[PDB]
Scaffold this active site. Structure first.
Site, short mmCIF file in Angstrom:
data_model
loop_
_atom_site.label_atom_id
_atom_site.label_comp_id
_atom_site.label_asym_id
_atom_site.label_seq_id
_atom_site.Cartn_x
_atom_site.Cartn_y
_atom_site.Cartn_z
N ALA A 183 0.98 -1.14 -0.08
CA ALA A 183 0.06 -0.02 0.02
C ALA A 183 0.87 1.18 -0.07
CB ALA A 183 -1.00 0.15 1.42
N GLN A 242 2.57 1.37 -3.59
CA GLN A 242 1.66 2.12 -4.71
C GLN A 242 1.21 3.32 -4.42
OE1 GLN A 242 0.43 -2.32 -6.50
NE2 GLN A 242 -1.25 -1.38 -5.22
N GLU A 254 8.65 -8.43 0.01
CA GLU A 254 8.53 -9.36 -1.02
C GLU A 254 8.90 -8.42 -2.44
OE1 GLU A 254 4.49 -8.97 -2.85
OE2 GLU A 254 5.74 -9.89 -4.33
N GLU A 274 3.64 24.70 11.04
CA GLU A 274 3.07 25.84 11.52
C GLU A 274 1.34 25.30 11.66
OE1 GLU A 274 3.92 29.85 10.48
OE2 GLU A 274 1.94 30.03 10.33
N1 LIG Z 1 -5.50 2.31 -0.47
C1 LIG Z 1 -4.65 1.35 -0.91
N2 LIG Z 1 -4.69 0.48 -0.08
C2 LIG Z 1 -4.09 -0.69 -0.24
C3 LIG Z 1 -3.21 -0.85 -1.48
N3 LIG Z 1 -2.69 -2.26 -1.33
C4 LIG Z 1 -3.15 -2.84 -0.23
N4 LIG Z 1 -3.85 -2.05 0.34
C5 LIG Z 1 -4.55 -2.15 2.05
O1 LIG Z 1 -3.46 -2.55 2.77
C6 LIG Z 1 -3.77 -3.83 3.44
C7 LIG Z 1 -3.19 -4.93 3.13
O2 LIG Z 1 -2.00 -4.79 3.24
P1 LIG Z 1 -0.62 -4.50 2.16
O3 LIG Z 1 0.01 -3.30 2.21
O4 LIG Z 1 -1.12 -4.94 0.75
O5 LIG Z 1 0.44 -5.49 2.86
P2 LIG Z 1 2.14 -5.66 3.07
O6 LIG Z 1 2.36 -4.41 3.68
O7 LIG Z 1 2.24 -5.79 1.60
O8 LIG Z 1 2.09 -6.86 4.04
P3 LIG Z 1 2.61 -8.23 3.66
O9 LIG Z 1 2.10 -8.48 1.98
O10 LIG Z 1 1.77 -9.27 4.55
O11 LIG Z 1 4.18 -8.58 3.57
C8 LIG Z 1 -5.21 -3.93 3.08
O12 LIG Z 1 -6.22 -3.23 4.03
C9 LIG Z 1 -5.52 -3.46 1.60
O13 LIG Z 1 -6.67 -3.09 1.11
C10 LIG Z 1 -3.24 0.43 -2.23
O14 LIG Z 1 -2.43 0.40 -3.28
N5 LIG Z 1 -3.86 1.32 -2.11
MG LIG Z 2 2.62 -7.40 0.22
MG LIG Z 3 5.63 34.26 11.19
#
Ligand SMILES: Nc1nc2c(ncn2[C@@H]2O[C@H](COP(=O)(O)OP(=O)(O)OP(=O)(O)O)[C@@H](O)[C@H]2O)c(=O)[nH]1
Ligand SMILES: [Mg+2]
Ligand SMILES: [Mg+2]
Ligand SMILES: Nc1nc2c(ncn2[C@@H]2O[C@H](COP(=O)(O)OP(=O)(O)O)[C@@H](O)[C@H]2O)c(=O)[nH]1
Ligand SMILES: [Ca+2]
Lengths: 440, 428
Positions: A12, A15, A71, A254
């Site tokens: 997340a 991306q 990963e 600020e």
């Molecule tokens: N807004 C948004 N949320 C995301 C995205 N990718 C994953 N999420 C959210 O993040 C959570 C899943 O975690 P990820 O960030 O995919 O997992 P990670 O940090 O890669 O962790 P692992 O894969 O377990 O090692 C879920 O709530 C997803 O909907 C994205 O591109 N945008």
């Molecule tokens: Mg992941």
């Molecule tokens: Mg000032």
């Protein structure tokens, strides 16, 4: 000087990083190869955009950014994609095995293998800074890496950089796009662990963003790409004060003074306007009054909660584009005699205003209309605590049965870290209640 | 005694400070080069008060520019009169003070203060007879407020027999940058009460109201506010800068104005009130100047003069006019309103006339009053301080820099003492 380093953690974080950095490049006229024709000072400079980009001798403008995932497959897309020349290979760090939706793996088992390497790459960015202001950390609450690795990284940054400010953009989980049953666990563990290490945290509720995409942009079934484009618009509004300068520009730091009355009370509510399709923007200009009004519509918030049912401790309006103070003050005066805006008795009621003259940009092929003026409101409301109450309730249902707990214990965690993380959340919910009580 | 050393600190300090040097330079015939191109000899007679002569023959402001950020000082340097300042008198850090008094006074400011005192010493040593110091700063931020009052303390240690005076901009929610301004202002007042001889209270509340209610500017900018400040400043320093009998140096002003050492916070007034650019064509009659200068709506501190009593007043009339008519009108005001002037200080209203009017006016009057109504200003800040302080709100910005709550408690109590000390003399 005033440099900021961005750290994008997990799917997340990474991306969202792609979306933000693409947009920053368009905002400053930086090409996918890093060249910026309008920048006459080659290999350095102390301009506003230098807070976010460093410069090489060959004219390349390079994000002050590290991307980290346990990963390799999301970071490989940055490596082979449109903006791959933007980043030096050493800014994009990958392991082989992810945290499998488990905080323990992100924090301990897997994350301890890569943490020294990440801090070395961060150190290399920090060493290129003449006056480092601090860090912006992007991550999900729900992921194993986003939760466990981020919390490990924040702890270590506190050690290596002292009290240097750390800001978070934190993706709060929603059932429509979530990938793990255990996201409530991961969310509470990371929130408890990072709470002392973070100066300010912007929670982005994936459901609020999903709703806005469905409702305001007429997207039937929003993807991450839809959500991220909108999130980047909001992140851009917040960082715009750091990356541009102007007469009525007001630095993010600020706003922070007004936004954090006690160290634990550091979670501002963001609301953004206008979010509108090209089809509907055509021939319909949204005025300063219209966009400011839209800030007090709860359907426009980045977190689902109801500020009409709590109290304000601060209110900030960050305008961008074609906006003058006269119109802002008129719009504010109207809203004050018409909306449900109640402050706690211990803080003054004046809104704090900043204006950047550079208008919003949109990315080619996206869903948002190019508008002449936009606003991000940042408020500090007791209502944000509803988002905690919802996650804590989910946590309690599963934890009363110890559902899935063996996955964490198997990785070396104890049940005592769970109850301890949960107690801190109860105390946080209590803190939010206490700040809203009138004085004696 | 002749020479005054001017210090301007922080964003506000340096913005009003630059305007001040702009306005007084034009009055003394000095151009951006530092070259005199004026007609009268009255212009140069006391030029040494504010200017150094370095062979040219060029005139260099005795002015030290201080900030913890470089921003506003680069603005000054590429501003209109920017070239006139001695480049060595620019003293800046990089890290800023984040509107935080503790950073200006204790942490960031402590790091920079010795360099400022080197520049003060270098300027003080070229003086036949240094009178003392004037400081321009605000009380609401971190540098002008925290570091400004640090500087005052250190200047007093090194020059304890010199006069210290300030032009101090008081914060208001009407024109406000941060919620912590009342904290910063209360901590600064505590300092000012002990370490200055005379403080001109420039109230951003008053300047806003004058701009809104009187000058019919629907949205005042800092520029508009500063136009009033630079006119008031030119006015209050007239007797220091031009040949003249009374209040002609900083110590004589203090002796006439300050009956008790703590009560040295003055309300300035100006007439006629003008906005920037837009000129007034009809000169004022001496009766009109005299009525307007005493009017609450011409006061630069948002205090109602009818809510207190005047301890002492200095009045400066500028332009070619009838000195007999001035004496008569001045005498008329006092006789008509005698209950507002304390009866235990006889003849507590002194009047000066100077022939040179300010740019763009044929006649002007400046008012300096020591009124017990100033207490309203301190009560207002006190109320804002307590609203936050009773819930200890926003305090972590200050404890994080090493401060204890005790220091806030003491600064509040001392400001409340000052209030009640004013009330004592309003009833005596
Ligand atoms: N807004 C948004 N949320 C995301 C995205 N990718 C994953 N999420 C959210 O993040 C959570 C899943 O975690 P990820 O960030 O995919 O997992 P990670 O940090 O890669 O962790 P692992 O894969 O377990 O090692 C879920 O709530 C997803 O909907 C994205 O591109 N945008
Ligand atoms: Mg992941
Ligand atoms: Mg000032
Ligand atoms: N009258 C006036 N007030 C100002 C100006 N600039 C800032 N202020 C006020 O000064 C206070 C903030 O202090 P500032 O001087 O910006 O911070 P510093 O640089 O840390 O000393 C607030 O009360 C502002 O309302 C100005 O140019 N004129
Ligand atoms: Ca450059």
């Amino acid at each position: 000087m005033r440099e900021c380093i961005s750290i994008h953690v997990g799917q997340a974080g990474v991306q969202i990083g792609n979306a933000c950095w693409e947009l920053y490049c368009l905002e400053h006229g930086i090409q996918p190869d890093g060249q910026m024709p309008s920048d006459k000072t080659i290999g350095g400079g102390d301009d506003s955009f230098n807070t976010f980009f460093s410069e090489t001798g060959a004219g390349k403008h390079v994000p002050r950014a590290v991307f980290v995932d346990l990963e390799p497959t999301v970071i490989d897309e940055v490596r082979t994609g449109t903006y791959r020349q933007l980043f030096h290979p050493e800014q994009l760090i990958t392991g082989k095995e992810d945290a499998a939706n488990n905080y323990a793996r992100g924090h301990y088992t897997i994350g301890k293998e890569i943490i020294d390497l990440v801090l070395d790459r961060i150190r290399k960015l920090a060493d290129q800074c003449t006056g480092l202001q601090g860090f912006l950390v992007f991550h999900s609450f729900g992921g194993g890496t986003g939760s466990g690795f981020t919390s490990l990284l924040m702890e270590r940054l506190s050690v290596d950089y002292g009290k240097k400010s750390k800001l978070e953009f934190s993706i709060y989980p929603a059932p429509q796009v979530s990938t793990a049953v255990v996201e409530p666990y991961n969310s509470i563990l990371t929130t408890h662990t990072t709470l002392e290490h973070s100066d300010c945290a912007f929670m982005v509720d994936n459901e609020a963003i999903y709703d806005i995409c469905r409702r305001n942009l007429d997207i039937e079934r929003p993807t991450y790409t839809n959500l991220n484009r909108l999130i980047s618009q909001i992140v851009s509004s917040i960082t715009a004060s750091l990356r541009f300068d102007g007469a009525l520009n007001v630095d993010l730091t600020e706003f922070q003074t007004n936004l954090v009355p006690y160290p634990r009370i550091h979670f501002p509510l963001a609301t953004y306007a206008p979010v509108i399709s090209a089809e509907k923007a055509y021939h319909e200009q949204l005025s300063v009054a219209e966009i400011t009004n839209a800030c007090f519509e709860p359907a426009n918030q980045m977190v689902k909660c109801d500020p009409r049912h709590g109290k304000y401790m601060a209110c900030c309006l960050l305008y961008r584009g074609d906006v003058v103070p006269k119109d802002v003050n008129a719009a504010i005066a109207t809203i004050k005699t018409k909306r449900s805006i109640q402050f706690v008795d211990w803080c003054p009621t004046g809104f704090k205003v900043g204006i950047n003259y550079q208008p919003p940009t949109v990315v080619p092929g996206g869903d948002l209309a190019k508008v002449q003026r936009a606003v991000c409101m940042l408020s500090n409301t007791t209502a944000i605590a509803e988002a905690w109450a919802r996650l804590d309730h989910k946590f309690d249902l599963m934890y009363a049965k110890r559902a899935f707990v063996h996955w964490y214990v198997g990785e070396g965690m104890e049940e005592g870290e769970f109850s301890e993380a949960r107690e801190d959340m109860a105390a946080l919910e209590k803190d939010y209640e206490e700040v809203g009580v009138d004085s004696v | 005694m002749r020479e005054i050393v001017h210090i301007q600190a922080g964003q506000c300090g340096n913005q009003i400070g630059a305007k001040f040097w702009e306005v007084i330079s034009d009055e003394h015939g000095i151009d951006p080069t530092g070259s005199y191109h004026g007609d009268s000899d009255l212009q140069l007679e006391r030029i040494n008060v504010y200017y150094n002569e370095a062979t040219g023959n060029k005139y260099v402001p005795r002015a030290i520019l201080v900030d913890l950020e470089p921003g506003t000082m680069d603005s000054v340097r590429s501003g209109p009169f920017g070239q006139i300042f001695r480049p060595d008198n620019f003293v800046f850090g990089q890290s800023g003070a984040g509107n935080n008094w503790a950073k200006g006074h204790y942490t960031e400011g402590a790091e920079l203060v010795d360099s400022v005192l080197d520049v003060v010493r270098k300027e003080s040593e070229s003086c036949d007879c240094l009178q003392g110091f004037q400081l321009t700063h605000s009380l609401g931020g971190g540098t002008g407020s925290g570091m400004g009052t640090l500087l005052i303390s250190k200047i007093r240690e090194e020059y304890p027999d010199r006069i210290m005076n300030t032009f101090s901009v008081m914060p208001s929610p009407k024109v406000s940058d941060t919620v912590v301004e009342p904290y910063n202002a209360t901590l600064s007042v505590h300092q000012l009460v002990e370490n200055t001889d005379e403080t001109y209270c420039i109230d951003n509340e008053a300047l806003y109201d004058i701009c809104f209610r009187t000058l019919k500017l629907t949205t005042p900018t800092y520029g508009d506010l500063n136009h009033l400040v630079s006119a008031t400043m030119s006015g209050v320093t007239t007797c220091l800068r031009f040949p003249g009998q009374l209040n002609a140096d900083l110590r004589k002003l203090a002796v006439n104005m300050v009956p008790f050492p703590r009560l040295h916070f003055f309300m300035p007034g100006f007439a006629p009130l003008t906005s920037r650019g837009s000129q007034q064509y009809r000169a004022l009659t001496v009766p009109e100047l005299t009525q307007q200068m005493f009017d609450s709506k011409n006061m630069m501190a948002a205090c109602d003069p009818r809510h207190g009593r005047y301890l002492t007043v200095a009045a400066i009339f500028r332009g070619r006019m009838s000195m007999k008519e001035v004496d008569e009108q001045m005498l008329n005001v006092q006789n008509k309103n005698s209950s507002y002037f304390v009866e235990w200080i006889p003849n507590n209203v002194k009047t000066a006339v100077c022939d040179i009017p300010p740019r763009g006016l044929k006649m002007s009057a400046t008012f300096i009053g020591n009124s017990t109504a100033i207490q309203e200003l301190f009560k207002r800040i006190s109320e804002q301080f307590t609203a936050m302080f009773r819930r200890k709100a926003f305090l972590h910005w200050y404890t994080g820099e090493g401060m204890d709550e005790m220091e806030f408690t003491e600064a509040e109590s001392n400001m409340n003492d000052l209030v009640s000390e004013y009330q004592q003399y309003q009833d005596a």
